[PDB]
Amino acid sequence: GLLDGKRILVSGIITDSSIAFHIARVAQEQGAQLVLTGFDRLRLIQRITDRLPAKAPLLELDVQNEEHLASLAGRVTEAIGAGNKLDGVVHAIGFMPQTGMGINPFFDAPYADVSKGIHISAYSYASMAKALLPIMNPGGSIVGMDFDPSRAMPAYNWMTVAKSALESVNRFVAREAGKYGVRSNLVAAGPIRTLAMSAIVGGALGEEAGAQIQLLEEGWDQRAPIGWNMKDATPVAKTVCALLSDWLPATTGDIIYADGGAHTQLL
Amino acid sequence: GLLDGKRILVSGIITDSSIAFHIARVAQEQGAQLVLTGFDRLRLIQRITDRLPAKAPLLELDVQNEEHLASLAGRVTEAIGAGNKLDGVVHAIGFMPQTGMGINPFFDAPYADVSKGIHISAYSYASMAKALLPIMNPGGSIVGMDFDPSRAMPAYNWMTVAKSALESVNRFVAREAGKYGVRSNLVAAGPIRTLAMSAIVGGALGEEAGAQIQLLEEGWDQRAPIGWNMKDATPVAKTVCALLSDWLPATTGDIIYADGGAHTQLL
């Protein structure tokens, strides 16, 4: 397996359609031993992760909670056994209050809402790296999930701003992670039909936002030289596993696009 | 003059070495009629702006204060006279608490501090545009100040992250500003020896940060095909005035680099 013998922490599972669920599945298919972290609904997350190929300990982590972060490394060391360190960390965490996304006008998101979204979606990449680098092995790899924010787009609004901040944060965590012989990169994925995204396309954040996002999805597949299947997270999971492996050993502070090549084409 | 008859709001003057001071001077030399906004120390700012080529009303604006923003357009309309609108807006506002810049390790900036810095340095570009677009003329121009955040750098730390967020915000304000026939752009300047920057080079945020920043400055001039003079803000002021003019009428959501060309060269 691509990740035989590696110990990898995977955050961000909430449903069986989470990108992180597929990352976790693929990583286990490839020989990795996982520790999972979950937010708020631990009983649900446990029930979901029971469906993974192998059992994995689940630890609670609210990235906005200082105590959770302070205790994190000790709790992971307990789960993987003293004397063992992590080889990989997956940040698959993102949130923006609905005032910051969709039909709510861009100028009407109050800063308390965007700040919460930036905390969870961007700053937390640094928080997690701070927590976990002390328990990571040389040759290790930290990976986060990105959605290409280099051009503005309808509806995504402040979440795009949050992703712009995340990409900047990633370049700084690579500097810190380098002192540990650890890489830090993001995977920029094409749009994926997670539960939240399905609800949004169905109009959860207003009809016009739903319509624009559906339009956005169609253009993506059309632009992608090898196509893009929003219903299939596995090509993105495989990409994260590539970065977790020893096979991109000279890539750090960087962004790998798992998007069908859509960002390389105009029409 | 390049800006004859234009009415332009200029934020961000705090000392006679502020980039915004030079923007204001150059704009007045070019025939613009100004309204100034200042933060906190209004008596000082008045004394500084007395030195400008022409008199200009000074209005208080703390970009973190909802009431200041709510009243802003009415106060500007009063200063410029009912029935007149603004043609230009200059955002020259930036701040990051010292935990987010310098020798303080990147991972040790508490989120309350980075959030304050992002509020002032990035979100406020949207706040000001929201406040002022209702009183801007078609063909108008909003300009903000950027420091190229596309690669990480020593010391600047979370301020670089804030600038990454600002660039993303700018692309979204261009969408909103377009409905008014208004452009929105940033000028990415090379490093300038403002009071704060002089103190930082002199070690205000720790010796090693001062040393790295001085090194950064030297490399800039060395890379710039036409050189770079950190002691002279006027080429950056002139660039802002270019964007405020009618001479870049098809540029919006964009970034103009006033940096001697340094960002286009590797060594």
Add this chain to the structure above:
Amino acid sequence: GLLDGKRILVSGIITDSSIAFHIARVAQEQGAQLVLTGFDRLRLIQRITDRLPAKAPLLELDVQNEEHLASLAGRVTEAIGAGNKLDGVVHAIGFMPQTGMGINPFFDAPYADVSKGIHISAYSYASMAKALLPIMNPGGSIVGMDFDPSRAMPAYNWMTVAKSALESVNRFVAREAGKYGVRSNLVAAGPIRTLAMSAIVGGALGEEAGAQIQLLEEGWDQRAPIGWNMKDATPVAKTVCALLSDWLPATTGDIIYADGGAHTQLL
């Protein structure tokens, strides 16, 4: 006028719909004294340029002709008078054989054809700078015309490759031009309905290429926050004049987008 007293060479006029025709017109409206260069059909070009606001000497320049280039500076000095130097140079030259554009498959352009297109469209920017820098004043400006090649697009095929080469060439000419106190930049324009482009949309290079290009044009206006009018070259002419002026004095090796902001937006 924006360019009062400046002496500026303008290449690339072939019809009254050439972008360079509008550059020349606007520059003369702004007080510039022009020298024109034309390719092959000098009698036609003279008849076209007779319609400019002021008379201007026309010099023959085939950018593929070593002798034309060797004699160029002497011929310009003769036209503007000994002891006078140029302040500005406009490169508005581009060509790709039809095997390199349109419905002809990308893989079927023979290298002799792409090499001719790269010679005329990219290398010649360096040729002209080599010829003219010896007769340019400090504070001068060289400007070339770009079409954003950062993503691939239907039909434009090898011309896009040529533009990618041009952008790289520009960064190197900025290094050389800097020794003379001269700036070098490109204006990346949105699509403009020149004669050649009209013929192409009408199917001169095959129906499907025409269709894709028309689609490309529509998306541009739709993406542009301030819109995009392919029938109007003046906003691009104005942008070139901005770079020819003293108002972007710290920008070199760079690209200014006169495209309605379309490149900053995804949808």
Add this chain to the structure above:
Amino acid sequence: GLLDGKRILVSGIITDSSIAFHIARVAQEQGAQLVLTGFDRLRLIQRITDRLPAKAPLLELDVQNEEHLASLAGRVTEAIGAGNKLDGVVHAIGFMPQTGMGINPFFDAPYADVSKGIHISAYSYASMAKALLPIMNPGGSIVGMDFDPSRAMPAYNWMTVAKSALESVNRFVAREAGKYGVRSNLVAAGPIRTLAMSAIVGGALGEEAGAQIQLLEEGWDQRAPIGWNMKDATPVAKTVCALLSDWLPATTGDIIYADGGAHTQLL
């Protein structure tokens, strides 16, 4: 092995320090069956490749020779056996005449020399893809070698321009390769001490060019968060193998940086 059962063509071996030699070695260590192509000095190349972990047929390919290209697919099919197709193609070909690199002034490279360099270094990526896609399997991968040309640099001169053209070509070959279910990407490597590069650092193209390149190398390692070892090609070989594998299945028209992260950092 990462590439078990894959059939892969590897061009560009000339010495045992060629990047392509290490690509070939690593690919064979990972279970790939290779076909090699070599230019001009076939007897030498055979002697060098005898040192690879496994035997591999060597086919002559001068990328400037139309007949070599016309016969290429038939010769490969013969070497791998009728009914078998390629899964991978590695383009590791680059050349620029010495008038286009080093101390020879940028403006003094005659176009015949740069055209030869662009033919070999950029156009040939399209030539090879044209030749080989008809004999590639769905899920296959074409990879070329890039040196980041987004900023100008001393000495590399027209080779940087050639790399800018290559990156553009890659995005177009991805469009064509997509019709075959094939990906096309480049690996942008940090500087590597190949024979040619060692000679250049030692002054083969003039002292000042040698000095600037040595300076360039040192800055790279200094900028790279995980460091950069110019004497070790294996991290770049591993990266090429990652792209040849099934583990980046949604990446095409793209660039992966195997450069220690140096391009993500300013200082």
